[PDB]
Structure formats: C-alpha cells, structure tokens
Write a protein that binds this ligand. Structure first.
Ligand SMILES: Nc1nc(F)nc2c1ncn2[C@H]1C[C@H](O)[C@@H](CO)O1
Ligand SMILES: Nc1nc(F)nc2c1ncn2[C@H]1C[C@H](O)[C@@H](CO)O1
Ligand SMILES: Nc1nc(F)nc2c1ncn2[C@H]1C[C@H](O)[C@@H](CO)O1
Ligand SMILES: Nc1nc(F)nc2c1ncn2[C@H]1C[C@H](O)[C@@H](CO)O1
Ligand SMILES: Nc1nc(F)nc2c1ncn2[C@H]1C[C@H](O)[C@@H](CO)O1
Ligand SMILES: Nc1nc(F)nc2c1ncn2[C@H]1C[C@H](O)[C@@H](CO)O1
Lengths: 232, 237, 237, 232, 237, 237
C-alpha cells in the first residue's frame, strides 16, 4: 500500500490504462475486461484489474491536472511494478480541420507548466512518448480501420485561461489537442524509468464551442489492441 | 450546469466548504449538515447542500492540485453565485515547533506553480486570503478553546519533489504548512472577485516523523470543520 | 555600530516607526513622543527614541525604494534587537472606489522586484504582514472612528514605468495602493524572523486625480501615526 | 536568389540532406550522387544537386549552431520549394552504453536555447520531428541491417559549457546525443510549414573523451534510402 | 516643479554631479564650486548650482539604490534639460589586485535588478556609459597623476545578499567594484536619450578587508571630485 | 590542434582579426597581409598568418551566430595563445540618422541569447569590449579622416525574427547596429581572460532602405580593415 493507493504488489498488471475520470475507468472495466475486480478506492480513485483476450490488464483514473496524475503514475511505477502507462482521455481542438470524436496520438506534449523546468535546470525538456508505443497504436488503428492523427498536444494548467491569444500560437504551431496531463506523465515516466503514451478523443472545440464516461470506445479499442502488438 | 458540475442555479449555497477528497465531502455532509441533499456527481466529485444551525451551507470536493481546484472554484463563483469558499484540508510541517494536529490558517500562500505569473504579467502576485474570513476563523477557534497559527502555506506542484532542496528554504522563511491548492484558489478568487480562505490540520511532519492516535487525529479534523462552519455564522453578523 | 547606523544595542526600542521622508522622523518625535533623544545621523538618516503613553518607541526614515529600506530594516533586526517594524507612508490608487486620503493597510504586497525570487529559489514567495499587527491597526482605527481598507499593495521598482498597461492589471486584481517598499520589508522580516506592517494614506490617484489642501494632508498624516501608535499598545495586550 | 543562397527556384530538389560541414556535403555529392552539380557557394556554404537511383536529391551544409542553420533551412523552405529536410550530423554521447559510430534518430530535441521560447510565448514547445520520416528511417536501417537508437537529442548553444553538472541531468533523462542544431531545425520547420528529421553519428564521448567529412556512410545510406520509402 | 524636485527649468546646469550620501552635496558646493545657490530641498535632498572655472555645474544626492536614483535622474533629464549625469560614490572590491582607495570608472554595469529586463522585453540590455565621458575621466585622472581602472561594475539590489557564491562569480568575470546604482542610471540615460557615467573609489574590500584613516578618505574623495570636474571641461572641447 | 582548428602553437599571431565569411578572410590576407600562409582549413574555415608593416597578424573566419564564433575564439585563446580578437563585420541599422557605410564600434552588445545568463547565475552581465582597444580604434579612425560611432550593438539569435517587435524597442534605446556575434565574443573574452573588440560597417538599414554604390561600399569595407590593423599598431606602443 502507498500513500494514495491501497493495494499490494501484484494487484495491478504491468500495463495500466488511465482516464482522468474514475467513472470512465469503472465503465471500461465493465465493458472491456473479463473477471474484473476492484483494487483501489482511496479518495474515490477507482482502480480495476482483469483480462482482455487472456491478457492481464489494469485501468485506473488519475484525476484532472498534472499534479494529480503525477502522484498516481509515480506510485504505480515505484511500488507496483508498472512498466507501461497509456492515458486515454479527452481534449479540445484548436485547428479548423479537426472535428469531434477524432482520435489523436501524442508523440509529444507542450506545456505552460513549470514541472519539467524544475527537473531540467530550467531548460527546455522535450516531453515525448515512447516510439514503439506510438507505432503500436498507429498500427492498431489501421487494423481496426480507424483514423488517427499523430502529433503535439498541449498540457494546460488553467482550463479557464486568462490569455486567449495563446490559442493563436497553439494553432500556428499545429497543436492537435488541448488537455491537462500529457507533459506531466512523460516527465514522470522519464524520471522514474517507465514508458508512456497518451491517446485522446476530441470532446469539444475551442473555436466553435461545440461539446459532447461512455461512448469513447474506439480510443479504448486502439489502446488495448496496441498493447497486444507490443507483447509480440 | 457546466461540463464539470451537473446542477442548477440555487442548488449551491453562497458559502461552500471544500475538502480535497470527494469522500470527505460526504462525511462532512452526513456529520454536520441537516437536511442534506446531493447536488452533483459528475466525475465522482460529490457535492451536497443542507443547513447548519439554520444556515444554508454547501460542501464539495475539489481534487488534488491547483489545476483541479481552479476548475471547480471558478465555475462555482461564476455560474452558481458563490461568494465564499473555504478549503479545509491537511498539510505537512517543516518547522520544528509546529506539531501534528495543529490548526493552520493560510493568510498567504507561496507556490512553485506558474499560474499566477501568467495572470500577473510575469511579476509577483501575493496570493492572499480575505482578511475578514481569516479574522472570523481566528475568533471562532478561540471560542472553542483551540489554538491556531496564522501565516504562509506553500502550494506545491509536485508531491514527490525531484530535489528536497525547497524544504530547507521553506523552513528558513517560516512556511507553516505544505499543501497543493491554496495559491491557486486565492488566484481564482482575485481574478473573479470572490472571497476565499484555507484552513489545514497538520497531518504529517517532514522534519522527523512521530505520529499520535486515530481518535485524537479525528477529533482535530472535526474541530477544524467546526471552526469553519462557526466562522461563517460570525460573518453573517 | 553598523555601516549605516552608528549606535549600540539598546538605543532603539523593540518597535520602530519608519517614514519614507527622512524629515518626518524629527516631526513625529517632537509631536508624538515624550523625552525623545537622538540616536543616529549617519548619511543624515536621523533616528529618535522616546515613549508614548509609557511605551518605549523609536522613529527613523528608510529612504525611497526596496534596496534602501532593506538595508535599514535588516540592520535594526539583526544588530539592535528590533522585533517589529511599521512603515508609515503614502501611496497612489488605481481603483475607482478608493478615494484620496484613504488609509490602507497592506496585508500582502505584490511587486515587480526580483529580491524575493532571489531568496525563494526563483519561485513565488507571498510577502505578507504579521496578522496580529494588521488586526491591531484595524481596531485602533475603528476606535478613532476611521475605517481602514485592508488588502493587497504593489511595490514598484520604477516610479516611472515604461509600460502603463500594468495599471489595468493591478486594478483587475484589486490592488489598493502603489508604493515602493512593502515587499522588501516583508521579505526581510521573513528572512530574519521579525514582524512587519505597512500603513499608507492615498496621496494621489493615478488616472483621474483630485486636489488636497496642505491642512487636509497634515490631518491625515497625523491620523495615520496616531493609528500606528495606538496599534502597538493594543498589541502589547 | 536569397540573401544567403545564390540559386533559382528549381536548382534544389524538394528534399535536401544537410551536414554541418560544407566539405562533408561536397564529399556526399561525389560519393553518393550522380551527375552532381554545384548550386551555391556564397560564404563557402557549398550546395549540390544530383540523383540517387533516379531520384533527384540535394545536399548542402548549414554551419554550426542554431542561428546559422535557422537561416539556411528557412530560405530553402520559403524560396526554393523544399518540402523535407534531413540533417545528417555528428554528436557527443553522455550515456555509458553508447559508443562511437552508433547511429541515433532524434524523435525529439531538448535545448538550452531561447529561440523556441521566443516563438511560444515563453512556454515549453516540444520540438519533435515528423513521425513518418522517423519511421521511414527506422525501416531503412532495418533493411540495411544497421542498428539505430530512437530518442531525445540535446541542442547546445555552448560547445564549451561553463556548467558540466548539466551533463548529469542529460544522462538522467536518457539523452542519446549532444549536438547544436536539432531543436532549431524543428522550430523552423513548424514556423514555416515543412517536415524535418535529424540523424547523427556519435563522433565522440563526453565522459571518456575519445574522438574520431568522410567515413560516416551508414548515416547517409539510411537517410537516402529512407527518402525512397517515403516516396512510395 | 516635479514631484521630487521643487524648481523650474533653468535652475540646474546641463551637467549634474550626484553623490549617494546627501550630505556630500553641500560639502562639494562650498568646497569646489563658486557662487553656489540652493535649488532644491524636497524630502531633504539638497541641490546646488554654481560654477567651476567659469563652467556652470550642479550637485545633488540621489539616495541609495536603483529605484531612488531612477526617479531623480529621470526628472532632471526630462524636466530640467540635463544632458549629462555623473555619479560620484564608493564601492566594494572582490578582486585581489584591486586595492583600497582605488578609483574605478564603470564603462559597463552588471546587475541582479529587473529594471532593464522590464525595459528590454526580458532580454539582455548592456547598460553602458557614454564613451567620451569615460575617456574624459581617464585623461583628467592621468593629468592629476592618478591611474584609474576602467571596466565592469555590478549594481546590487541587496547589500546583504542571501547567497555569497555570487561574489566568486563576479571575481571570475572581472567585476571591478560592487555598488547599487550604475545600471539604473545607465538604463534611464538610454531611455530618455542623455549621457551618464559612474566614478567610484574602493571603500571596502569584500573578503580580506584593510584599514583607512579619516584623513586618507577625504583625500581620495576630493581627488574623485577633482577628476569628475576636470573631465567635464575636457569634454567641453 | 583541436577538433575545429588543425594547427599548432605558433601558427597564429597573438592578434587575430575575424570576419564572418571564410571567403572574406582570404580577401583580407591577400589584400593587406605580407608573406601570408594558410594555417587552417578544417570545415572550410580558412585561417591565414602574415605581417602588416612588420607586425605579425592573423585573420580567420568565425561563421554566423554566437554558437559558432564562441567555439573558434575560445580555442584560439586557450590553445593558441591569442591575446586580442577583433571582429570585423556588417550590421543592419535601426536608427534614422545612422546611414549606410557608417563605421560602428561596439563598446557594448545587447542580446536575445541566453549564453551569458547561463554563465552569470541568471543575472544581467554587461557584455563589453576592452576600453583600450575601443580607444585605439577611435584614434585610428580619426587619423584616416573617418567618422565612427561608439555605442551598443544587438546580437540576434534569429536573423528572421518571428515578431518584428524588437526593432522599435532597439531603436528606442539607441542600438547602433544589429548583428549576430558581439555579445557572445565578449562573453568568451570575459570567461577566459582575453581582450576583444567588434567593428562593423552598416550594410543595410531596416528603417527604410536606400542603397548606394559598389565601389563606395567596398571602399568603406577596406577602411574598416585599415582601422583594425592600424589600431593594433597603436596598442603595441
Ligand atoms: N478544452 C479543454 N481544455 C483542457 F485544458 N482540458 C480539456 C479540454 N477538453 C477536455 N479536456 C480534458 C483534460 C482534463 O483532464 C479535463 C478538463 O475538463 O478533460
Ligand atoms: N506533505 C504534504 N505535501 C503535500 F504536497 N501535500 C500534502 C502533504 N500532506 C498533506 N497534503 C495534502 C495536500 C494535497 O491535497 C494532498 C496530497 O496528498 O494532501
Ligand atoms: N503613485 C505612486 N507611485 C509610487 F511608485 N510610489 C508612490 C506613489 N505615490 C506615493 N508613493 C510613495 C512611495 C515612495 O516612497 C514614494 C515615491 O514618490 O512615495
Ligand atoms: N560533444 C559535442 N557537443 C556539441 F555541442 N556538438 C557536438 C559534439 N560532438 C559533435 N557535435 C556536432 C554539432 C555541431 O555542429 C558540431 C560542433 O563541433 O558538431
Ligand atoms: N560593499 C558594498 N556593497 C554595496 F552593495 N554597495 C556598496 C558597497 N560599498 C560601498 N557601496 C556604496 C553603494 C551604495 O550607495 C552604498 C551602500 O552602502 O555605498
Ligand atoms: N540586418 C542584419 N541582421 C542581422 F541579424 N545580422 C546582420 C544584418 N546585416 C548584417 N548582418 C551580419 C551579421 C551576421 O553575421 C550576418 C547575417 O547575414 O551578417
């Protein structure tokens, strides 16, 4: 048991999918996993372990924001033997040609946070994902027949930003989605030695303002299927 | 109803108490509020509204970290007409004479986050509480025979710090407690024109550990809540 | 004797009043203190020590700007055993509802200076006053039938700033007054473990100014000192 | 003709390989290209255009450092219709298990420069390469039977750094190679809309101090071969 | 009349000498200038105007620290038509080969202040003196048989810095002396299109200090003024 | 022999002139130096050594940008015993009265690069030239009947700026010319204890273009070199 997770070494698989919402994790366990059982409930952060096509898999929420997800991804890596972490969240689009329900794969993640500058002597650390994992996900999407854009994400500290002009800069630099965790997960994976990847479903559009724990299944199917490709 | 709070105008009181753990909100509602009702459950962040000695009061969790609590407090203030927000949590101690189960009141809050510099043109914005609320809390604590320290808190962005260098620095400058929300909540209150206050009970001490008892810790957590609810009543007068 | 203060331990009281204008020290000594005696004159910064209603008190100017008052407040604290510093000055307002001659008490102080970042490993240090001292001032004021505003102050490094947009930002975040010292003094207090407070009267309203008679100005200045002095006795209780 | 390049639209191919040394470009033109001809010589920055297996290809040096290579990559993209840029340079290793002659592919690039902060409102821009290009290079290396590590590079402003302790941070975060251009090329590709990739040969070791315009052929072969995979 | 200088266009010469110690102005006026008359006394900052070998010249203190001298140098330049500012003060040395009482001329000034970054969109602005003024000073000194060191100065915001390692760094990069104004004055000069220069005598040697008689000190101070004054006449050619 | 310069101790003179273009080094060697010989060719950055009026002098290119010229100057100073480095290049003008073919001398150099902050603990290091060298250049220019401005240069990291905002700022603060090396060369000289100087001829004007003639431009470039070589001779005396 750790400060934020009440479980023992072995309760989690070496691979864990992590949505920001605890209720979506529960839903993923009920819909995609077999013989699924609850392994954690402290502070309401539901965690589950089960099987997908004979493969042991875990799924647990991580809360909103870098500070919250940094705590959980670190504890799993250092005390529960987790090797791979795949974040399956939602994001906001800034580009004109990006529409709701689109699937994005974050090869990299920009941020307005200071966490990585605190780790890198105040210089620029390129927060990137594991190449193999990115590739496994791309191959899984193709096999499933689902479209998916690979590119940069932007991890925001303020969902309600006081500076809207920064969206112009994001668009100019081809940012595919705005969320609040990627850059933090990638910094942790590198500090504590593990591999990570973030997959997101465009759930709203920052320019047009159109919006949408259920129904984001293609994202899940790609993630689970990409894990098996990695096992081979 | 916003993307994070599925409720309507009137479902929340103009005063909201906010713990970090959503399960703690249910504990508070069940223990101190009368005629309580659930007003939100999105993402599992339970909210409740009831009354305390005839006063309408609400209690809802905010999650861990400045990014999380900044979303909730912001929506409460701009979409549900909330005027006061009081955070009630825990923190770690760095000062030798600050002991476990001590009640700390955050008049100010330092931080390693960059959100207030983004707001303040890259300068130093002193994140502070509302004077009157601090005052009402100090007076409420006294009426209950409880001791309370008033000073600076530190809102950390990384629970697990890469370099344990800041602990010596915080101690050298008198920081009373280390948590993860105060600075962000004070920034939101200033930006949208509302009032806020943070109260914490020392749950752990970085500078040499040495715990106490379960019944004693739980007595102190209840006193903190008692101080919060009673401070509100004094303010109504 | 220190580099900027030629005196010995015991010449200053444990409480010192400090105006920005050096010429204000002699005025205060002969107008409010009893049995005053001179204790400093290095570089022409005259210091005095006497009593107010039996209480031992000292007064001496600090000069304009953070760098200057940092030198004086620090030498007093580490070499003359001073426990409390109270700055008494003027400020400019940016809020429409804040009028000329208003008395403001700075619970916190924002700044564009780098002194605190140099102290706090380039992070955000909330420079705040001592809570009790703030409360003592508020109560002393009420007793004199004067209503004081408590809030954030902004300590500027450039009286003539190249960019004027920062004023809109200060107004948006509730800054009560603009001056040039508070954040420096609060930083020093936290560094050497002492207590500080800044009280100011609005002497000008940046953007849309008014007009004041010399008689009005001395009346307000005297009220501020009276407030500062009575707050010390309240604190002694 | 541009301020730093004396040529006309059409003199360069839509793809250009760029080593830092002008003499290595000349060597690459003589050794790998057919019917190669000089297209530029201003300030000594030799540029050449020719063919590789019937495919029109260009090769031109860019000088040392981000400021120098920023000028050249920008002019090629805006006035000569260049679509892809592949940097083929050398680097210094910091990790124990990395040895001379090893080939590295930069999926990302960290830096202590301020150029990207000047473009991104002083926030953290993740300087990454084009996914397809990275993948084409990985596939080419496998087909050639050459080993190649994919990861983060570090673009230094000071070859002779006053802070050696920063090498500890680099090593801790898995930096595969230290050079002086990647982060700059990736920022330019994004600003002016083109694709880029950096390939480097470990030419020295920062810890052991062992050192090495010729002989770095595997790097070249992978780059040229990866371009053809991209054409399909 | 300006906020800090109660005078009118024409009361100050187009060249002003400014010491850090306000008490130095009256001394200089009666010891080096002819037919001196008082032109300022606001806040006790006394200013004088007279002639030196027929040339019109003024003297007035600026107070310790960048914020203070920025106010005075700027009002003189924009409201009284001053074209040249020469600071005459003291500094502390960090280099072994720089001895007590040495005269140093600051061609450039480093700093830990943020004033210039605020002016230069957070980039590096090289705060430098006017080349001719520097050369005039070097030649005036030689003619008086005094060899002056020309180089970099460092303007500190904190006389008592929390970190002492910065001194090793200053020594490594050749800093000749440590003071608290030059970078502020040079910034103002560049902002309002005027000329400036800082001349200083080593009054203390940080780390490994020596000892000086009061007689030695006045001799050196007088030499510096003599150097500053003769440099102005050379420049008039 | 280093990884960038394939030569031995004695192959370079203690004074090296450095243009940005390697082809320009050959032009200078062929035009002004007697008995010249090539001493380096690595990466194509040609170096030469010969004599001017019996004085041994070297000339080698440094490439574009601070990262490039920082490598070469550093190796020359620490591995080839070079004492003086004079950069001779071109720059763009921002000031209205600075006209094409004007000779600018960089007493100081501002920059948007971060290399000097990495060296100076994140503070402001004023990147300046060696006084005597500036002086020798001003005196050499005069003996040839040439006019020369002395002031600040700006070393840019991006030739093609993302935001043309800094041009107005540079102009407001009096920058004489825009190039890409000065600040980095001055930083290297300070770090390894050598002397440096940058001289430029205005090759273009951002503020409204309007060129001249080829024969006239080339006459001015030669005068600059003449000023450089002659300034060295004065220094030998
Ligand atoms: N427009 C948007 N902006 C940001 F910053 N995050 C967005 C988002 N749309 C979805 N998300 C994801 C990330 C957070 O966990 C959470 C915030 O509601 O859901
Ligand atoms: N030592 C400590 N450090 C930090 F950063 N936060 C502490 C804490 N002790 C308690 N807390 C409170 C604040 C967070 O919401 C939450 C983090 O577990 O509990
Ligand atoms: N508008 C204003 N702006 C600033 F920066 N300071 C102001 C002021 N009005 C009064 N003060 C106080 C503070 C300094 O000691 C001094 C500066 O003249 O008087
Ligand atoms: N150890 C090293 N450090 C840095 F910064 N760059 C290195 C290098 N080894 C090779 N390079 C590459 C990049 C430059 O273009 C050039 C510098 O000599 O060659
Ligand atoms: N060691 C020293 N450090 C600093 F920061 N300033 C020094 C000094 N010695 C003299 N001075 C000059 C500059 C200020 O006006 C004033 C500060 O006492 O005198
Ligand atoms: N307008 C201008 N801007 C910048 F940044 N540099 C300029 C220039 N005009 C000439 N130069 C000099 C300096 C570089 O070495 C080189 C860049 O082409 O020539």
């Amino acid at each position: 048991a750790t400060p934020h997770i009440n479980a023992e070494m072995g309760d989690f698989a070496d691979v864990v999918l992590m949505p920001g919402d605890p209720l979506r994790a529960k839903y993923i366990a009920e819909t995609f996993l077999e013989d699924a059982r609850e392994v954690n409930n402290v502070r309401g952060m539901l965690g589950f372990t089960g099987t997908y096509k004979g493969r042991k898999i875990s799924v647990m929420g991580h809360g909103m924001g870098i500070p919250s997800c940094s705590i959980y991804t670190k504890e799993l890596i250092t005390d529960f033997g987790v090797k791979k972490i795949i974040r399956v969240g939602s994001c906001g689009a800034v580009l004109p040609h990006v529409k709701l329900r689109d699937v994005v794969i974050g090869m990299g993640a920009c941020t307005d946070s200071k966490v990585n500058r605190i780790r890198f002597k105040d210089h620029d650390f390129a927060a990137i994902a594991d190449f193999d994992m990115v590739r496994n996900a791309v191959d899984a999407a193709k096999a499933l027949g689902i479209d998916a854009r690979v590119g940069n994400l932007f991890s925001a500290d303020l969902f309600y930003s006081p500076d809207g002009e920064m969206f112009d800069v994001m668009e100019k630099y081809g940012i595919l989605g705005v969320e609040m965790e990627a850059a933090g997960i990638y910094g942790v994976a590198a500090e504590f030695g593990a591999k990570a990847l973030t997959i997101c479903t465009v759930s709203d559009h920052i320019r047009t303002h159109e919006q949408t724990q259920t129904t984001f299944n293609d994202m899940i199917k790609i993630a689970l299927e990409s894990v098996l490709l990695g096992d081979k």
